[PDB]
Enzyme design. Structure first.
Site, PDB file in Angstrom:
ATOM      1  N   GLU A  18      73.785  93.746  62.029  1.00 45.11           N
ATOM      2  CA  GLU A  18      74.271  93.079  63.233  1.00 45.11           C
ATOM      3  C   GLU A  18      73.130  92.765  64.205  1.00 45.11           C
ATOM      4  O   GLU A  18      73.099  93.234  65.343  1.00 45.11           O
ATOM      5  CB  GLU A  18      75.359  93.929  63.896  1.00 45.11           C
ATOM      6  CG  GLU A  18      76.107  93.248  65.009  1.00 45.11           C
ATOM      7  CD  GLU A  18      77.171  94.130  65.621  1.00 45.11           C
ATOM      8  OE1 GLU A  18      77.527  95.153  64.998  1.00 45.11           O
ATOM      9  OE2 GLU A  18      77.635  93.814  66.735  1.00 45.11           O
ATOM     10  N   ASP A  19      72.171  91.969  63.734  1.00 45.80           N
ATOM     11  CA  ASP A  19      71.018  91.499  64.496  1.00 45.80           C
ATOM     12  C   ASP A  19      70.138  92.631  65.007  1.00 45.80           C
ATOM     13  O   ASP A  19      69.486  92.468  66.044  1.00 45.80           O
ATOM     14  CB  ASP A  19      71.421  90.611  65.683  1.00 45.80           C
ATOM     15  CG  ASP A  19      71.970  89.272  65.242  1.00 45.80           C
ATOM     16  OD1 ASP A  19      71.541  88.769  64.184  1.00 45.80           O
ATOM     17  OD2 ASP A  19      72.831  88.718  65.955  1.00 45.80           O
ATOM     18  N   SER A  20      70.107  93.776  64.334  1.00 46.15           N
ATOM     19  CA  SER A  20      69.203  94.842  64.726  1.00 46.15           C
ATOM     20  C   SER A  20      68.111  95.031  63.674  1.00 46.15           C
ATOM     21  O   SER A  20      68.314  94.813  62.476  1.00 46.15           O
ATOM     22  CB  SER A  20      69.976  96.141  64.947  1.00 46.15           C
ATOM     23  OG  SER A  20      70.762  96.467  63.814  1.00 46.15           O
TER      24      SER A  20
END
Ligand SMILES: [Zn+2]
EC number: 2.7.7.6
Lengths: 52, 45, 315
Positions: A18-20
């Site tokens: 999740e975009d990390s």
């Protein structure tokens, strides 16, 4: 603008979702993408009247 | 105590609250507060 | 009478005519002034008043009738519409005499207002006084002859209402020029928004000609830090920047060695600081070298006290 850093592709930590992204702490300690920020505050005296 | 340094003429000096902003010898109105000689401690990490 | 001649005015009463009693308008000559009023009309003969002091006790002065009236002040009446008329022309007596050889210095409106106090209007009202001859005198043939008669009529109308009586002197006027730093600051202020803003009406021209005289005295007086460097910055004064120091240095030193007691004249106490720093620097220069003499100046103004006056005037 930028640096050439080492990336591997996998799902190892489960935090990469999740975009990390997961980071190497050693590179950060050595100063990878360390930077310098500068902020200029401007101030001045003012004339309420002519002598005030 | 409060020391001042000129723009590029390297004139070192000290203004008080009696004079305008003017480098005393070069006649340069872009002056700079001279750095403090005081030590600053760092963490090196 | 003014406060500088109060004791004087009582003195001639005492010396010429002791039979005349006298009472000045002060703590001596709120009830105390009322016991002073007790028998100040029967026992009291002449009452003296400073022309600031009437509106301290006017409540019990303008009410009762009065006889002969003397006012030794012809430049603090001037034109009408002031506190002057408010406390003066409400007196109840035909006898009205003003003691001043300079009543007419600004305009004939002052003449009309001064004639009002003595006479009840042998000429006419203020609108009448104006519409009669105000404009014709100013503009002025087409003016002269009719104006000549309209003015001689006034002269004959007011002439039996005010008396008139009158080494060498050299008047050399030097025409110095604006210096280049002066011309720069002159053009800079010349082309600015504030002047137009004053002209259109939001401000007065009195504050735009005071600042353009502020630069003519010397450049260093239009500074915003005037008070902050007037007497604590020995570069505020300077010389040769004013366009008048040279014709000051030369002209004053031509008398310094010649031993001629001379008068230096200003109008502002702010320029006094500059001319005082200048003369202190002159003193320093003269004292450091030899065959010279200290300049020895002094400054007097409203800042000092009324007590000092004559002393310095004498020294
Ligand atoms: Zn410099």
């Amino acid at each position: 603008a930028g640096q050439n850093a080492i990336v591997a592709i996998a799902c190892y930590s489960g935090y990469n979702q999740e975009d990390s992204m997961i980071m190497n702490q050693s590179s950060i300690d050595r100063g990878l993408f360390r930077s310098l920020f500068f902020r200029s505050y401007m101030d001045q005296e003012k004339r309420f009247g002519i002598s005030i | 105590g409060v020391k001042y340094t000129c723009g590029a003429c390297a004139h070192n000096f000290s203004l008080n609250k009696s004079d305008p902003v003017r480098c005393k010898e070069c006649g340069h109105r872009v002056i700079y507060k001279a750095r403090t000689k005081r030590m600053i401690q760092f963490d090196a990490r | 009478c003014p406060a500088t001649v109060l004791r004087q005015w009582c003195n001639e009463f005492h010396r010429w005519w002791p039979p005349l009693r006298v009472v000045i308008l002060h703590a001596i000559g709120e009830s105390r002034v009322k016991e002073l009023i007790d028998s100040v009309f029967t026992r009291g003969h002449v009452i003296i008043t400073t022309y600031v002091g009437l509106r301290i006790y006017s409540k019990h002065l303008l009410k009762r009738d009065w006889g002969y009236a003397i006012l030794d002040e012809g430049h603090k009446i001037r034109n009408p519409n002031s506190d002057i008329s408010l406390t003066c022309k409400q007196l109840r007596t035909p006898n009205r005499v003003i003691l001043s050889g300079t009543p007419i210095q600004n305009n004939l409106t002052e003449l009309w207002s001064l004639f009002d106090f003595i006479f009840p209007g042998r000429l006419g009202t203020l609108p009448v006084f104006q519409n009669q001859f105000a404009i014709p005198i100013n503009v002025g043939n087409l003016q002269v002859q009719v104006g000549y008669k309209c003015a001689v009529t006034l002269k004959d109308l007011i002439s039996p209402y005010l008396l008139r009586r009158v080494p060498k002197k050299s008047e050399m006027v030097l025409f110095c020029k604006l210096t280049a730093p002066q011309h720069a600051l002159y053009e800079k202020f010349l082309r600015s928004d504030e002047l137009s803003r004053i002209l259109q009406g939001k401000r007065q021209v009195l504050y735009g000609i005071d600042i353009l005289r502020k630069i003519c005295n010397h450049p260093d007086l239009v500074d915003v830090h005037a008070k902050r460097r007037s007497k604590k910055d020995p570069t505020y004064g300077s010389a040769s920047k004013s366009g008048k120091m040279q014709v000051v240095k030369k002209l004053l030193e031509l008398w310094k060695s010649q031993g001629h007691k001379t008068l230096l004249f200003t109008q502002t106490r702010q320029m006094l600081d500059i001319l005082e720093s200048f003369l202190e620097r002159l003193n320093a220069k003269g004292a450091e070298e030899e065959d010279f003499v200290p300049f020895k100046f002094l400054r007097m103004d409203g800042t000092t006290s009324i007590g000092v006056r004559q002393s310095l005037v004498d020294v």
